[PDB]
Design a protein around this ligand. Structure first.
Ligand SMILES: Nc1nc2c(ncn2[C@@H]2O[C@H](COP(=O)(O)OP(=O)(O)O)[C@@H](O)[C@H]2O)c(=O)[nH]1
Ligand SMILES: [K+]
Ligand SMILES: [Mg+2]
Lengths: 169, 501
């Protein structure tokens, strides 16, 4: 029996809440998201994942320390069609380390999701996002679509494995 | 969108506990809420800080006329907080089993220093509200494991749970009989209205005198079980307190108290989250310059923030610290004496390190008040391993240092580079200490404030008492005026309430 806390960070409008709902509830839309729980198998070991939604408090960058307490993994999401949501990835990463103070922060489990790949007017190149992800101590990068449910399940399988690593270490 | 909306139903200024509970309630009921704060963190005077965050907090205490429309006038708001005073900091540990100041800084993030030192009773306004509203899912709790008393000027654990008594022999069997008999009676004093008959008019301490109780037990009950103002509390008030104490026992641990992991500071955020979940919009680092009054109706119409934006609302909730000195010229505040200490040992040493204790030190000289001492261990996630975080509080008399150092001195000994013959028998070491006074704006009548429109409500900061009942009660009272006849923070929807075939 193991409980993992995973938070999903990133600017408003990138798809954080949809990524969560798509993963747990396999349902996409278009109010009231808090946190979802899901039982999963990570390399044969049974774990429990607790996904925390921002309840929109990032709209004006007002997420408090309580929100980060004891996070096992931090998902950084951006919109491949909105280059500015990609440039804030560092600021969200820095913030996480500031507020969460994790053990061995230089190796903390960060997973980056380039969302909305189903949209045709992409502005951020796969290579560009991969280079940045690599430069940050080689963190995993997945391109997703909460709308068409592309790569979400697999993306969360890694998020879960990495979350369990941090929780066990 | 993503541009701050220009109108809401409720605008709340300040993210202290009272304010957050009321914002949660309004949002839960369906009101569009805007919740701002001038600080870069949540809590206001209910906040908690990392060590580095605290030093920054310490520091401090050591554009709209063109927006005023036709037929309006402004009520400027405060632009500088003046609720903290007499800050005194001492670092006894060495600068760089011996914990140096450098270690404190390195592990600073392991600390979560509450500006408010309170505890939760197993049953009470806040805890009952956390369970009912489900805000409880946002926090984890730790049980208080020891109740301590300070008699003869000496520390000692007081047996409470009827079991804890029969596992000790610190009391004669003549006193134990008076105990069970006395406690079992208090647990239901209103069933025997013949024990506090004529004492109704008198105080509690007075009442205890004429009872089948020695002075020792009479002490423990008066200061550790009831814990009420032995002077400012009549017999009823005192008995009622004991009943509360006793009933809360054994519900989670061997005492009636719980403490939130990471500290009291997590509580306002728990409620703010509920507000957000139900639609509340949050803005930290966002001050309001003034209130906009309709000269005709005399109602507050909107606010103007630091950016020059007019934001309309029907109700305005403001925490005391944000009101101008002019709006507060007649208010008579009280003060809270606070002391924060980082120690290398427990006030009462034992094998079992990870203990959370509460010690009560009665006032020695007249004009002073009982001092509440709360000791947190590292597992409470409020301090680094190897240290204890001790909080001292009391209604003010003079300055924080003058009111409390006396007590710190009797319990702790300043760290030094002088090795003693035997440390195990020595008093715990004080590594770092902070003293300060906080304004007490609790129990202040609304009308004490000048010219505030009827649709503008005021929240006080924290009180000097052990619990948060004042934070819940005022919120509840506010909700009754803003949303008449509406369940206060009802439990969120659930598919299990009504079970079908
Ligand atoms: N086309 C498309 N829209 C998406 C996707 N994920 C989310 N959205 C939409 O983009 C908007 C913002 O999404 P939301 O999940 O609320 O993300 P959040 O604000 O980061 O938590 C909503 O209109 C969603 O329906 C996606 O994968 N593809
Ligand atoms: K920022
Ligand atoms: Mg969202």
């Amino acid at each position: 029996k193991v409980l993992l806390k995973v938070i999903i960070l990133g600017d408003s409008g990138v798809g954080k809440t949809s990524l969560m709902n798509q993963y747990v509830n396999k349902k996409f839309s278009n109010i009231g998201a808090d946190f979802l729980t899901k039982e999963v198998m990570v390399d044969d070991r049974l774990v429990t994942m607790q996904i925390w939604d921002t309840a929109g408090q990032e709209r004006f960058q007002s997420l408090g320390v309580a929100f980060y307490r004891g996070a096992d993994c931090c998902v950084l999401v951006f919109d491949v069609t909105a280059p500015n949501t990609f440039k804030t990835l560092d600021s969200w990463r820095d913030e996480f380390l500031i507020q969460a103070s994790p053990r061995d922060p230089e190796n903390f489990p960060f997973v980056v999701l380039g969302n909305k790949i189903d949209l045709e007017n992409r502005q951020v190149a796969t290579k560009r996002a991969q280079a940045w992800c690599y430069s940050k101590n080689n963190i995993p990068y997945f391109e997703t679509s909460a709308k068409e449910a592309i790569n979400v399940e697999q993306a969360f399988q890694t998020i879960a494995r990495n979350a369990l690593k941090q929780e066990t270490e | 969108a993503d541009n701050l909306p220009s109108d809401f139903d409720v605008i709340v200024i300040g993210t202290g506990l009272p304010e957050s509970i009321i914002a949660a309630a309004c949002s839960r009921s369906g009101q569009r809420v805007l919740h701002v704060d001038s600080r870069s963190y949540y809590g206001g005077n209910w906040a908690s800080f990392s060590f580095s965050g605290l030093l920054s907090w310490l520091k401090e205490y050591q554009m709209w006329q063109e927006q005023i429309l036709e037929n309006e006038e402004a009520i400027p708001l405060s632009s500088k907080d003046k609720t903290i005073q007499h800050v005194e900091v001492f670092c006894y540990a060495s600068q760089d089993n011996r914990i140096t100041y450098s270690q404190i800084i390195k592990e600073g993030r392991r600390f979560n220093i509450d500006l408010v030192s309170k505890l939760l009773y197993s049953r009470g306004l806040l805890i009952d509200l956390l369970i009912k509203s489900n805000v409880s899912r946002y926090a984890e709790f730790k049980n208080i494991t020891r109740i301590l008393a300070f008699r003869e000027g000496t520390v000692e654990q007081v047996p409470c749970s009827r079991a804890d008594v029969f596992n000790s022999k610190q009391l004669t069997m003549v006193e134990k009989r008076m105990l069970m008999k006395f406690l079992t009676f208090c647990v239901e004093y209103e069933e025997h209205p013949d024990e506090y008959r004529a004492y109704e008019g008198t105080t509690f301490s007075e009442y205890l005198k004429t009872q089948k109780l020695t002075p020792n037990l009479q002490y423990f009950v008066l200061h550790s079980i009831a814990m009420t103002s032995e002077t400012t509390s009549c017999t009823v008030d005192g008995l009622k307190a004991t009943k509360k104490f006793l009933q809360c026992l054994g519900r989670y641990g061997n005492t009636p108290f719980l403490f939130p992991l990471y500290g009291q500071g997590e509580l306002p955020q728990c409620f703010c989250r509920m507000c957000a979940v139900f639609g509340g919009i949050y803005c930290l680092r966002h001050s309001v310059q003034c209130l906009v009054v309709d000269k005709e109706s005399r109602k507050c119409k909107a606010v103007i923030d630091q950016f020059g934006q007019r934001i309309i609302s029907k109700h305005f909730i403001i925490e005391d610290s944000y009101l101008s000195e002019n709006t507060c010229s007649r208010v008579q505040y009280r003060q809270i004496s606070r002391a924060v200490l980082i120690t290398d040992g427990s006030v009462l040493r034992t094998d079992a390190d990870q203990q959370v204790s509460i010690l009560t030190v009665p006032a020695e000289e007249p004009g002073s008040f009982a001092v509440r001492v709360i000791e947190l261990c590292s597992s409470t996630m409020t301090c680094m391993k190897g240290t204890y975080l001790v909080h001292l509080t009391c209604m003010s008399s003079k300055t924080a240092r003058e009111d409390l150092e006396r007590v710190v001195q009797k319990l702790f000994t300043p760290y030094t580079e002088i090795e003693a013959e035997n440390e195990q028998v020595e008093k715990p070491r004080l590594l770092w200490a902070l003293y300060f006074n906080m304004r007490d704006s609790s129990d202040i009548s609304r009308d004490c404030y000048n010219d505030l429109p009827s649709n503008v409500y005021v929240c006080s900061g924290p009180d000097s008492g052990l619990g948060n009942d004042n934070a819940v009660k005022q919120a509840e009272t506010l909700f009754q005026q803003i949303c008449p006849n509406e369940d206060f923070c009802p439990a969120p929807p659930n598919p299990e309430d009504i079970v079908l075939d």
